[PDB]
């Protein structure tokens, strides 16, 4: 549908802003220079809101995801496959806004982990994983049925 | 395969906890 397609084209700006604000807030509590680089756009506000409201629960899982990603050993060659299978298994049960933010958070954690392990210049490739998965696995469609990404601005705590 | 399932399970747990903690603004 046309609404699904608009949402899927907005995901890149949402994910890029989410990555920026999430990294900035964790740094203010080693930096990834690829994450430090329009802010008043509705999609930029959405990414920032979702970084803010997930902060407390994301912190509780930091140690688990660090251990699991070390075990997974993602590389340039297997990261598409691992990201897709992980994201597919996440949504097998269903979709709600928390799981959508968990997907964005997984793209953030994956991008950060591979950079810290020496895979440079990869953030754009993770962004494409997130955008393409949401289009092709009905996540953008669910978001369109909520009224688009702007509906996430009305999530609080 | 075992690591993929563990990671996806944690994402679902974290996402469901986030979803339960959020209301309207
Ligand atoms: Cu655990």
Residue numbers in the entry:
A (entry chain A): 21 to 49, 55 to 62, 66 to 185
B (entry chain B): 80 to 104
Structure paper excerpt:
Mitochondrial poration by pore-forming BCL-2 Effectors, BAK and BAX, initiates apoptosis. BAK is dormant in healthy cells. Its apo structure exhibits a stable globular conformation incapable of executing poration. Autoactivation is mechanistically similar to direct activation: binding of exposed BH3 of BAK or activators to the activation groove induces conformational changes in the electrostatic network at the bottom of this groove destabilizing helix α1 to initiate BAK unfolding.
To stabilize and structurally characterize directly activated BAK complexes, we rationally designed BID-like BH3 peptides that bind BAK with high affinity compared to WT BID BH3. Based on activity and binding profiles of monosubstituted peptides, we produced disubstituted M(3)W(5) BID-like BH3 peptide, which exhibits ~30-fold higher binding affinity for BAK compared to WT BID BH3, judged by ITC and SPR. In liposome permeabilization assays this peptide is similarly potent as WT BID BH3 in direct BAK activation according to AUC against peptide dose EC50 analysis. To reveal the structural basis of direct BAK activation we determined the crystal structure of activated covalent complex M(3)W(5) BID BH3GGC-G184C tevBAK [M(3)W(5) BID BH3-BAK] disulfide tethered as BAK BH3-BAK complex. We observed two similar complexes in the asymmetric unit, and both exhibit destabilized helix α1 electrostatic network in the protein core as observed in the BAK BH3-BAK complex (electron density shown in Supplementary Fig. 9a). Directly activated BAK exhibits 2 hydrogen bonds between α1 R42 and α2 N86. We validated BAK destabilization upon direct activation by determining Tm values of apo BAK and the M(3)W(5) BID BH3-BAK complex ± DTT. The reduced complex (15 µM, 95% peptide occupancy estimated from KD) is significantly destabilized compared to apo BAK or the covalent complex (15 µM, 100% peptide occupancy based on the crystal structure). In contrast, the cavities in activated BAK BH3-BAK and inactivated W(3)W(5) BID BH3-BAK complexes are more modest in size (64–70 Å3) whereas activated M(3)W(5) BID BH3-BAK complex exhibits no cavity at the activation groove. Our new structures (10 asymmetric unit BAK BH3-BAK complexes and 2 asymmetric unit M(3)W(5) BID BH3-BAK complexes) capture destabilization of helix α1 contacts to consolidate this mechanism as the basis of BAK activation by BH3 ligands.
